[PDB]
Design a protein around this ligand. Structure first.
Ligand SMILES: Cn1cc([C@@H]2O[C@H](CO)[C@@H](O)[C@H]2O)c(=O)[nH]c1=O
Ligand SMILES: Cn1cc([C@@H]2O[C@H](CO)[C@@H](O)[C@H]2O)c(=O)[nH]c1=O
Ligand SMILES: [K+]
Ligand SMILES: [K+]
Lengths: 307, 307
């Protein structure tokens, strides 16, 4: 519907990936390749929602530094509405810098994301009515605990989908599971939140039971080669095997996952079929060089899934 | 004079400096600080010329990638005329990525500068008449040998000041010294060009004699703690001691040097006094965090020099 839109609250980064063509020198500047790409979990999810055909508004923060403007401009080009993003007077725009291998393997990564703290409850409250009229809200855990609490306290019965981002950053959701419609942790995040070891497939039922006892509506638990375990507090649960994928670069798979889950909810799709769809979204991120595959589309995901 | 302008032909980079706050992990992404800054020897010199009060036009190349646009936009903000810069359809904009230490020390550097080869003789010839009406031309040795040869062959009696950039890239000037008005090598560059060891102060006279025998008009030879040796083919030569400087970050000192030399030539200043002025330009770059000190100005350099 032409007035239906989705609101994403999370980080917008410039990802910088550099690798040397040959063996590193340290004692010299080495000819290599350097790529600047848009990143940040929330920004990536928003771009994926746009590619999936939703009107997606990003609520985020960048500095005033020209490169922050390029970030916002490029994310607009892919379909995202960036007009409510906060510009932070004279601040570095967040970035995530990785040194990769001559063969594409990670070495060391620096992340500089303090301006995520500029995504305050005060900022979000300036868009209260807009947020409260979205079809769904996606929040990432890069934002502060106070900002996440504000979203969950003021969602006004709009479902909030939460991306835990990392084992470090996920813990702010632990006491607010009863306010979250859908949570999408990996194995380490679910172990970290629950305090229960996930040693194998046999352990997911007791971990899911812990999440539901603490009030979580829906769990979408990614278990790597084991596939995805999904669980609804009303009783439905199940496993979905992974989709055989030729993996090109792993970055952005979970951001595509989350977009697929939220897009399918907005489109009226049932839970289990939404999890399988989102697995196909992630598969298209996995088979692409960039962290957002610009061939992400409803049509392209369905064809992948039918295989 | 309101129609006097200077033309700079060289590289425009995004410099990316990242350091971890603490000891590196490799096995993790480390919280740290990441800074994006305009760079590239030719772009830096142009910005310094603008700060020194000259109308400076940059002839350079960036890709179409939003971040290339931010580069050009920011360089305009400091006074540089960027309207003739070549945009390269769908190309990475050049970058220079350094991993710095928790204490500011260099570790490893990647440079990605192949689009410097887009600064072709064909491109430059589209601005032949404009180039041939500049008061002075500054070229860096990031550009190809064919492009440098084009500039030196078509300068039409406009003086060409050449920045050798590095020991690797300087060698393209060796056979064209008789076409260069002023060359500004450091000790390793002058050793590399001449084939003569510069073991100490006692060796500069024979190295300068080699440059003049091969047709170089003016040599400005930086010898580190020994200061600067200058030499004119017509017979004047001398040493200028370094200016005591509280060094904050070494990047951009030579770019300020070159700007001071070319600015002083355009302003009518004699050779020896122009070398001492340019030493003060470099001193202000050295005492600044960024690779271009935005307090660079004629007034601020003179006051530094009188001390
Ligand atoms: C270490 N890190 C990384 C990110 C981003 O994740 C995306 C891939 O999903 C990349 O584009 C990064 O910019 C983040 O948002 N928060 C965080 O802590
Ligand atoms: C390794 N390297 C570095 C540069 C630039 O030098 C400036 C400082 O003077 C920095 O801004 C770099 O971007 C260059 O132009 N050509 C080259 O080969
Ligand atoms: K990818
Ligand atoms: K500096």
């Amino acid at each position: 519907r032409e007035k239906d839109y989705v609101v994403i609250i999370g980080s917008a980064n410039i990802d910088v990936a550099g690798y040397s063509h040959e063996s590193l020198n340290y004692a010299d500047s080495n000819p290599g390749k350097i790529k600047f790409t848009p990143g940040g979990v929330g920004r990536n999810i928003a771009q994926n929602l746009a590619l999936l055909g939703n009107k997606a508004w990003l609520l985020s923060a960048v500095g005033s530094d020209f490169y922050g403007q390029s970030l916002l401009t490029q994310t607009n080009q892919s379909g995202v509405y960036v007009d409510k993003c906060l510009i932070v007077p004279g601040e570095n725009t967040s970035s995530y810098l990785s040194l990769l291998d001559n063969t594409g393997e990670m070495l060391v990564a620096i992340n500089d994301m303090n301006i995520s703290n500029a995504i305050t409850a005060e900022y979000l409250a300036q868009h209260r009515e807009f947020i409260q009229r979205a079809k769904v809200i996606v929040a990432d855990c890069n934002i502060s605990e106070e900002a996440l609490a504000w979203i969950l306290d003021n969602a006004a019965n709009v479902p909030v989908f939460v991306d835990p981002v990392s084992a470090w950053k996920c813990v702010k959701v632990r006491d607010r599971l009863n306010q979250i419609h859908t949570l999408k942790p990996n194995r380490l995040e679910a172990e970290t939140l629950s305090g229960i070891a996930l040693s194998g497939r046999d352990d997911v039922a007791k971990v899911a039971a812990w999440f539901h006892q603490h009030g979580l509506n829906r769990l979408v638990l990614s278990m790597g080669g084991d596939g995805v375990y999904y669980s609804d507090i009303r009783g439905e649960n199940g496993w979905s095997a992974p989709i055989k994928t030729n993996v090109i670069n792993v970055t952005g798979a979970g951001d595509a996952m989350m977009a697929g889950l939220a897009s399918c909810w907005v489109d009226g799709m049932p839970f289990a079929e939404s999890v399988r769809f989102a697995q196909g979204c992630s598969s298209m991120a996995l088979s692409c060089e960039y962290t957002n595959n610009p061939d992400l589309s409803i049509a392209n995901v369905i064809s992948l899934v039918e295989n």
